[PDB]
Every structure is written in structure tokens, then in C-alpha cells.
């Protein structure tokens with residue numbers, strides 16, 4: 113079980129770890145988060161009490177280092193940092209635990225929500241989407257734009273998701289215009305899976321990461337990316353059977369975890385209606401269709 | 413964006429453009445099978461591709477053999493239209509290629525867009541005008557060449573005959589759309605008006621009769637009456 117200690121909490125902030133969120137008052141004696149499950153990526157995120165503008169946070173994996181949070185009064189945010197001195201860190205953590213100044217990541221997940229949301233998400237892939245090689249962890253916030261959004265500005269702060277564009281030469285084989293536009297299997301299976309992502313696990317990892325940035329930070333480009341990766345599968349007549357079954361499990365847990373009051377913004381009517389009711393795979397997403405019907409039948 | 417009443421003069425500027433109408437590409441007669449069920453039999457169609465400034469018409473004839481053994485023909489027709497328009501553009505010298513293509517029906521946008529991916533600087537535009545180009549098959553010479561075709565074939569016409577020697581493109585397009593709107597609303601009356609006087613003929617190299625300027629005014633006025641009429645006969649006004 114790993115720990116992310118906090119130097120202090122000088123400004124009133126809502127702190128979330130995974131799908132859990134808690135409020136910390138100004139200068140409250142808060143000194144971090146313990147009992148974090150090993151073996152998964154995690155995200156710690158922040159919304160200040162005084163400016164709900166800018167949700168921001170950090171993706172990390174405690175196997176890759178000892179990480180802590182410290183408020184910076186110049187840049188005005190909670191920053192993640194790495195402590196290289198292993199014994200300085202265990203000592204900090206041990207003393208904070210002894211004074212019981214750390215909240216505990218909750219132990220029971222009867223439905224393992226977090227595993228199911230991050231099953232294919234790896235740190236190494238996150239670090240290629242979010243480029244900042246001097247740090248082992250990755251900063252993301254509400255306002256960051258995607259490479260594709262930038263095409264249609266600062267590249268050092270972009271989300272480098274894989275570009276998907278259904279009316280592009282990459283998507284459409286010359287001479288197969290109609291075939292490839294109405295059945296995107298060649299773009300899914302040959303261009304993206306075999307060529308770009310190499311396997312479906314990596315495709316699913318980017319799809320899951322895009323969803324999580326959309327949900328936790330309201331990142332619009334990430335929501336665009338999540339829906340495009342869904343639509344590319346649902347609009348392919350030929351999809352490996354293991355992928356379709358896994359996709360149903362993936363989307364089910366994403367829809368299950370979504371705030372009920374955010375479905376007006378984070379869910380794209382057109383994509384979901386086409387995917388569940390018109391696409392080639394309209395019949396291959398029973399659990400996702402079941403939970404979308406019993407939870408957002410308005411959208412449909 | 414979309415072409416409408418507000419930006420109508422843009423059709424006659426010096427940027428090359430083409431209208432594409434696909435309404436006569438897939439044509440059928442619906443009939444009864446010996447078992448009493450209904451079947452369609454296709455007849456020859458055409459893509460109507462028109463330069464509104466010069467009157468040049470690229471009439472691509474769509475022979476019924478193109479549908480043999482194909483499914484979902486109304487959807488295929490849109491993609492066949494876009495394939496043939498893209499082939500026409502690639503056949504033209506660069507300085508003759510259009511800068512815009514305006515489709516008369518919005519369902520042609522994605523098919524044409526995908527076939528023209530190689531041409532990123534050719535704008536594909538819908539329109540809010542309800543143009544009467546479906547009535548092109550009421551022009552006897554165009555109908556005749558479509559029905560007689562035994563293979564795929566491109567035929568070139570000038571739909572303005574020699575009008576541009578005496579009138580502007582704006583005025584010629586207005587006359588054309590009036591004639592076609594009349595043929596669409598009441599083809600019989602329209603054709604009666606155009607041929608009523610046996611002394612005005614159609615030149616072998618023309619599509620319409622050789623009216624003097626004065627006779628065109630008379631004709632145009634008779635066509636307006638017909639259109640308003642039918643708009644009464646229809647609506648009872």
C-alpha cells in the first residue's frame with residue numbers, strides 16, 4: 113500500500129483520488145492519502161474552493177517512485193513532486209501516519225470500479241499522450257487542447273491523442289470510398305489496430321484514459337476522443353469477438369461511474385444512438401445498452 | 413457555407429463553379445410481378461453537372477447496367493454520382509477545375525466530400541435554393557440522348573444555347589430556372605408554350621427555340637402565369 117503525503121493544505125480545495133472526492137478547509141491539518149492500491153495507475157485531482165475554473169490533477173503509478181503534493185503560492189496550485197531520498201520519504205510518511213493526519217483510500221470495492229476503468233491504462237502510454245519527460249507523473253487540466261483540436265496552440269501543453277478522422281485519406285482507401293466510409297473495418301483493424309496501436313489493449317487504454325480525463329477534468333477534447341474511438345468500433349462491420357465483449361464491459365463501467373448530472377454535456381447523443389441502435393454492433397453491447405436505457409433514456 | 417438568396421450573385425463571378433444534381437441518376441418504373449408483388453425496372457439516368465456562368469453542361473449518362481447485381485441502389489446512386497463528378501474534375505486541366513461544387517441535395521455532401529479528398533481546396537457546398545434541375549429530362553434532346561444510350565457516355569451541351577451573346581449569365585440562369593420550373597410544375601402546358609408557333613424552330617445545335625428578344629419576353633411572361641396558376645390550381649387560390 114503506497115502513500116502520497118501532502119506538505120500542507122494552505123487553500124480550501126476539493127481533492128479527489130480516483131472516483132472518490134473529499135473537501136479540505138483552508139490550513140486544515142491535512143497531510144495526504146495512504147493505503148493507495150498498488151498495481152493500478154491513479155489520479156489525484158483538485159478543484160479550488162474559490163475558482164471552480166480549472167480542475168487539474170496528476171496521473172501517477174506508485175511503483176515508479178515516491179510522489180508528494182506541495183502547494184506553490186506563486187503559481188497558485190497544488191504541485192506533484194518526486195522525492196528521490198527514499199529514507200527521507202518513509203520518515204515523512206511514517207511520522208504523518210503516526211499523527212493520523214492522512215485520509216485512507218477506501219479498502220472495499222465490491223464491484224472493482226477502479227480496476228474496471230483503468231484495466232488497459234498504462235503509465236508509459238499516458239506519458240506519450242502527455243509529454244513532459246522530466247517527470248514520472250502527468251499533469252492534465254480542464255483547458256488543455258488536443259493535437260487534433262489544435263489543427264482546426266502551445267504544443268508543449270497538448271494532449272497527444274491518436275488522430276481519428278472519418279473523412280480523411282488515412283480512413284478511406286482510394287477506390288473503396290463508399291465501402292470504407294460506410295464500413296470502417298479497414299480503418300479500425302488495419303490502420304489503427306495493426307498499424308498504429310499494435311493491439312486492442314493499447315486502443316482500449318487510450319479510450320479509457322480519454323474517458324477519465326473527460327469525466328474528472330471536463331476536458332472537451334478528451335470527450336471528443338472517447339466518442340470517436342467508440343464510434344470507430346461501432347461503425348465497423350468486422351470486429352474481433354474479444355474486442356466487442358471487452359468493449360461492452362468497458363463502456364458499462366464508464367456509464368455506471370458518470371455523474372448523473374453530467375450526462376447533458378459528456379455524452380454525445382448522435383454517437384450513442386448510432387452505436388446502440390443503428391450501427392453494425394447495435395446488438396453487441398447488451399450491458400452498456402441495458403445501463404444506458406435504465407439511466408439516461410432521455411438522451412435516447 | 414450554404415448557397416442561398418443572400419449570396420446568389422456569387423454564382424456569376426469569375427471563380428469556376430459547378431452545380432451537381434443527382435435526382436435523375438437512379439430512375440425506375442414501379443410495376444407488378446406475375447405473383448402480384450411490386451418490382452422496379454431501372455431506365456437510363458444522368459448526372460446533371462452545370463457551370464451556371466458559362467452554361468456548359470456535363471451530362472454523364474448512367475446506363476442501367478451499372479445497377480446490375482447491386483444492393484441499396486438509392487444509396488449507391490449518390491456514391492456513383494460522386495465517383496463520376498470526381499472523375500470529371502480529374503479529367504479537366506488544373507486551370508479548368510472548379511473552386512466550388514454546389515450539390516442540389518444535402519445527401520450528396522459526404523459522398524462527394526469523400527471522393528474529393530484529393531482536392532482539399534475545392535469547396536463542397538449545399539444550397540438552400542430549391543432548384544428545378546430535376547426537370548432536365550423534360551428537355552427533349554437531353555431525354556433522347558439518355559434513353560438511347562447503350563453504354564456509359566458523357567455528352568457536352570450548352571444549356572443557354574447562344575443566349576450569352578445577348579444577355580448576361582445572371583439573366584440566362586434566371587431564364588433557365590424559369591423554364592425548368594415551368595416544365596416541372598406542368599410539363600404539358602410548358603411544352604405547348606414553347607412550340608405553339610410553328611415558325612420558331614430549334615436549331616439542330618440548340619436545345620431551346622430561337623426566340624427574338626421580344627418573343628422571349630412574351631415566353632417568360634407566359635411561363636410565370638403557368639407557375640402562379642398551377643400554384644392556384646394546386647392550392648385553390
Ligand SMILES: CCc1nnsc1C(=O)N(CC)CC
Nearest residue numbers: 129132133134215216217218
Ligand atoms: C477517499 C478518502 C476519503 N477522504 N475523505 S472522506 C474519504 C472517503 O473514504 N469517502 C468519502 C466520503 C468515502 C466515499
